[PDB]
A paper describes a structure:
The Tol-Pal system is essential for maintaining outer membrane (OM) stability during cell division in Gram-negative bacteria. The inner membrane complex TolQRA harnesses proton motive force (PMF) to establish transient interactions within the periplasm, thereby coordinating cell envelope remodeling and facilitating OM invagination at division sites. TolQ forms a pentameric structure similar to that of MotA and ExbB, exhibiting a volcano-like configuration with a narrow periplasmic end and a wider cytoplasmic base. The pentameric TolQ encapsulates the dimeric TolR through its N-terminal transmembrane helices at the periplasmic end.
Numbering used by the authors:
A (entry chain A), B (entry chain B), C (entry chain C), D (entry chain D), E (entry chain E): 5 to 223
F (entry chain G), G (entry chain F): 14 to 37
Amino acid sequence: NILDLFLKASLLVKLIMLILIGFSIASWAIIIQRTRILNAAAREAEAFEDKFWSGIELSRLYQESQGKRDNLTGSEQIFYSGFKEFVRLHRANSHAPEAVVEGASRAMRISMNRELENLETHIPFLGTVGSISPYIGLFGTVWGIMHAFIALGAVKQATLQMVAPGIAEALIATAIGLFAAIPAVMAYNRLNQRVNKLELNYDNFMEEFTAILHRQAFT
Amino acid sequence: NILDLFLKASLLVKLIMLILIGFSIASWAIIIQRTRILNAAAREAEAFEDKFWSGIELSRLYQESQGKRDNLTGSEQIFYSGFKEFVRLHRANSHAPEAVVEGASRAMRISMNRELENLETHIPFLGTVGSISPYIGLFGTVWGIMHAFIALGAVKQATLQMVAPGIAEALIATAIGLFAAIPAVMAYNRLNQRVNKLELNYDNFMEEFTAILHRQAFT
Amino acid sequence: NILDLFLKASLLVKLIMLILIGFSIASWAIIIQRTRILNAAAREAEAFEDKFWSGIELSRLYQESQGKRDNLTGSEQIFYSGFKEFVRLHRANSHAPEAVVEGASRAMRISMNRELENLETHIPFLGTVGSISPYIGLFGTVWGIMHAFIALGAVKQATLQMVAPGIAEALIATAIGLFAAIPAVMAYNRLNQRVNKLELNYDNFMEEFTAILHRQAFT
Amino acid sequence: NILDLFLKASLLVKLIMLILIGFSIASWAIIIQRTRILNAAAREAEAFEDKFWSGIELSRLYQESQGKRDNLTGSEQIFYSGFKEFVRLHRANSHAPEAVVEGASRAMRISMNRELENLETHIPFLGTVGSISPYIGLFGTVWGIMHAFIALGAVKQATLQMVAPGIAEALIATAIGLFAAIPAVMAYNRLNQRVNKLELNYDNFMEEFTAILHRQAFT
Amino acid sequence: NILDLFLKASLLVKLIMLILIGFSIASWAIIIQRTRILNAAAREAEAFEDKFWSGIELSRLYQESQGKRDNLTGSEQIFYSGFKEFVRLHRANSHAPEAVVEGASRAMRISMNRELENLETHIPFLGTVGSISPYIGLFGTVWGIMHAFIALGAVKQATLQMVAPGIAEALIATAIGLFAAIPAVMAYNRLNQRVNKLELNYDNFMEEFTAILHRQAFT
Amino acid sequence: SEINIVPLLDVLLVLLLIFMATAP
Amino acid sequence: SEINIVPLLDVLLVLLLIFMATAP
């Protein structure tokens, strides 16, 4: 049925179907890859927030973080970036108690930007697929229907029997286009929402730690 | 009429409508739930502002607020956090005139963010529904039309009368898709505008109270 | 003839027509009210600017402004809010001019926000209506085509008098949709331009007054 | 041909077919008027910088610019305003170095905003025309076809020969609408880019002059 | 096939096809030109970051860079404009620890603005093509349908054999319009996304260098 | 920047309606 | 957020074939 129509198609229709099949495969692979990373990031963030609010001294936390060298991810990195700069400035620039807070905030911001850039890779491709596929299907269908009109115009009379085959091979392309297009929008929206939640959590933690440092500096 | 067409449809066409019906039900439930909460928040904010600008001294108002500790919502929570931070910071290192103001402003921003986060739940589901429904409807329609013409092609020397019911029962899918898509798109913008108005109100209150604190600290 | 076609239609298209008529009426009312408020505002602003740059002393302007308290609108508010702040801090300690300038500017920004919010009240509804009407028209057209196809499939060798109702029912929906869509789309931009011009005038006045205050403070 | 079709149209279609001509005439006039002004501004902007950077004591240039009072446009106005504010503010207070630079920088944004406002007139009209015209064309077409069907249905003749001219004459509104729409969009897109290119040079010149003043502020 | 319809078409249809083909050629040429430059810029930035962090002294890097005064591009320029400022101002007034940081930052901002302006050329043409192209295919289709209907009205035979070729020739305009429209719409977003990453990298490098100079200044 | 489709859909619907009504 | 009804066009053209087969 469908295989016969695929075989009977010309070269342009075959190419325009293969493009969409490849697009669908790539989209599914991207979704499967990204979900696990987002889940792991969420779990690590929650665990570290609980550990930080447990009530252990900050020197012990810094020692434990240094025990893992520079291989840190998520909020652990931010807490490592600020505390390193703060202690460095307090030794030298003891005169100005306001510059240390600016240094700590500047150190935290760059790190946070780096993790947020890391998390959101390969996402806009799904939006491109979901915004482009239907037009490709429409172009294929228009080509097929125009060919059908040209073929029909030759004879002075024809029934539905000799115009039936064109319809199925015309609609196959748009069916495949919709099938490829549907899941991309859902994946796009869900992944964007998860990234936003992580971003707000990071911002809240950064502001809390900056407040603690500001209280400690002016004494 | 419509019931007979639904009964005589194929399995996929019949199944493709239950999803859209469920989506519509969920959308209506979410809208009804969100409206009441937003209205209550607006009323509470107005009442608290009216009470605050009445002329009662701030100490008694703070005592009343601390009576309920932290089970507060919105402007009263912001005022409580700001006042507590102000008194705590001024108790120790009152030499600085600007550090106290900066700390109070930071605390107020922190407390406002976690309320604006709470007010904005379940909204993106409406956008997802409104962006995904028409594609499903059109896929159902395309499948129905293709199946009808394929079944027709077997019969030799047919007429339009046998064909018409197929398209008649096929267009129901796209009708239902548009019906389920429109209101979800309408409600999104209204809810966003209400959230924006509440955010503006909170920002104005925070700025006024920061100015009031600044006048006291600067002397 | 055209109305007779409406009188013999189904219930759903009647509901669609009623909804679109209500939308049109609301749009017209909003346009009429906004075109008066935004016209009065500009004349008030221009008159105040001419009076301010006429050459009279600032103290006389302040006395006249405080005479008509609780009814100021527009730039008259911005001059009144900032100036009263400037004399409040200057008599407090008579040092730190930057604090005086910042306190003067903050009140002016706060006052400007209220006026802009008051001027931008009922605009997004027109945009929503203009964006949403054609799809309701499309829903009506799809229903009409469905009824026409059912009528063709009902009786063998159908005549024109039995296919006419669906074709008649299809066109009115599109006509009403476009008729309701156009004026809202025009009025949206027409009002946004006026709002932008008023905002620019307010910003220029605020900057010039701040410049005068800054020059006087550091002498 | 076309004249007969226009003559056979109804009153409403004829009335519609004049707004779409007025729109085209207005759009062409606006484009022709704006191009010359933008070209003159670009030539003057490119001609002043060469004189500024050729190497000449700035006092002589300022004295020469004093001659053409109330006639300066472009970067000359910015230069004059900044220099005048700098000289006036330096003479009174000679202690604070940063205040002089702050005032000189503030005195230039007002002028830049004024010229940018001057150079950006009558573009939203082009945007509105380009966004509106096709819908009016479609409304005219729908109305004409409704009248054609009503006229056809009364008589018992059902052949195509007496209904074809009505359909032929009812399809001119859409062509006129698209013909009016295209140039407006093209001109809008081009003029916005030209304005942005003009703005960037002013921004760069402002920053460079602030930089050259900063070094003289501290000696 | 296509050639027969192209030859049998009127003059306006042929002109429309020629215009659309020219637009497609221009779009493809612009895409090919831009991709190579956008890739080379990223390669150079990645190459320079490692050399900066490799551990060589800054003075020797400055000595190496000063031999290529008129061939620098990218981050190197942002470096070169910075150091030269920091050397000069520090020779005059080294007492102020905050003036030198701003004096260094201004030059880096200017250079970054110039580089970003240079990177984005010819992009808006793609958006103009994407917005304009379908409006010409619509004109072609409407003209073809009008000619077909008037030809049918002229003759005395209500036959489909002479209306089929006109409808067949009508759809070529829409096909070619979509063909010209799609790739430009893809490339516009692709190139904007490419530019944003380079903007982020430049901002991060500027922040890190500003931090290093800030740390050095106070000591 | 964006592609508008409503005019094409309206024109196609009108053409379908006229061809459906002309054929009895 | 947005409504996309592009594939509907693909349906309409197909129907336009039917009435060109044996009807005006």
